[PDB]
Paper text:
The P genotypes are further classified into five genogroups, P[I] to P[V], based on the sequences of the spike protein [name]*, one of the two proteolytic fragments of VP4. It has been found that almost all P genotype RVs in P[II], P[III] and P[IV] groups that commonly infect humans recognize histo-blood group antigens (HBGAs) of the host through [name]* in a genotype dependent manner. In the present study, using a multiphasic approach, including X-ray crystallography, glycan microarray with a dedicated probe library, bio-layer interferometry, site-specific mutagenesis, and molecular docking and dynamics simulations, we found that P-[name]* can bind to all blood group A, B and H(O) antigens but on type 1 chain only, without the capability to bind to any Lewis epitopes or mucin O-glycan cores.
To investigate the structural features of P-[name]*, a recombinant P-[name]* variant (62–232 amino acids) was expressed in E. coli and purified by affinity chromatography with GSH-agarose. The N-terminal GST tag was removed by thrombin cleavage to obtain a purified protein with the molecular weight of ~19 kDa. P-[name]* showed the typical galectin-like fold with two twisted β-sheets consisting of strands A, L, C, D, G, H and M, B, I, J, K, respectively. According to the structural superimposition, P-[name]* most closely resembles the P-[name]*, with a RMSD value of 0.442 Å; it also resembles P - and P-[name]* with RMSD values of 0.483 Å and 0.532 Å, respectively. The RMSD values partly reflect the similarity of the structures although do not have absolute correlation with the phylogenetic analysis of the sequences. Here, it is shown that the structural differences between P-[name]* and P are more pronounced than those of P - and P-[name]*s.
Numbering used by the authors: 64 to 236
Write the structure that this text describes.
């Protein structure tokens, strides 16, 4: 099989697969909803950004969100979510990254993303509801890595993608 890259698209991902996103610049990286109780997204903020209100298109709506990135050297991924149609988005996990990669996976009713600071970012679970039916729309090129190969996803998120598009076969010893 071919891990990627795949171009921005919308689909409902199966459980037990990581989607590894490779955005180029700040903005919305990906979003997903179950159309019932969760509307979710990951935002990207470049280094060296003082607290500022930015506009993001989430599910077609114009949403103003106050963001900051105090890191001089690393990019900041921000997980955001709301739990009702008219609810406010709030910021949850963050991933402070030199690689500009983030990732999400549905497993066991939970939604996992990477959080922390590279090269020591780790998967962490959101478990406030059953997330199994949440779809995705990606706004960056992305790769698909099975949970059985989670070690490969961890290594890429923390250390970078290979310089060529052969991820199926490229892994550190």
């Amino acid at each position: 099989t071919l891990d990627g890259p795949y171009q921005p698209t919308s689909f409902n991902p199966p459980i037990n697969y990581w989607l590894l996103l490779s955005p180029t610049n700040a903005g919305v990286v990906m979003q997903g909803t179950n159309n019932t109780n969760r509307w979710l997204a990951t935002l990207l903020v470049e280094p060296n950004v003082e607290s500022t209100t930015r506009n993001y298109n989430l599910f077609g709506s114009s949403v103003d969100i106050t963001v900051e990135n105090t890191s001089s050297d690393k990019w900041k991924f921000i997980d955001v979510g709301k739990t009702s149609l008219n609810g406010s988005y709030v910021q949850h996990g963050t991933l402070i990254s030199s690689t500009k990669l983030c990732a999400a996976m549905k497993h066991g009713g939970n939604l996992y993303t990477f959080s922390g600071t590279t090269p020591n970012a780790l998967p962490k679970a959101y478990s406030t509801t059953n997330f199994d039916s949440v779809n995705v729309t990606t706004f960056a090129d992305f790769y698909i890595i099975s949970r059985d190969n989670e070690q490969k996803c961890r290594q890429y998120v923390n250390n970078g993608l290979p310089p060529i598009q052969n991820t199926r076969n490229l892994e550190a010893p």
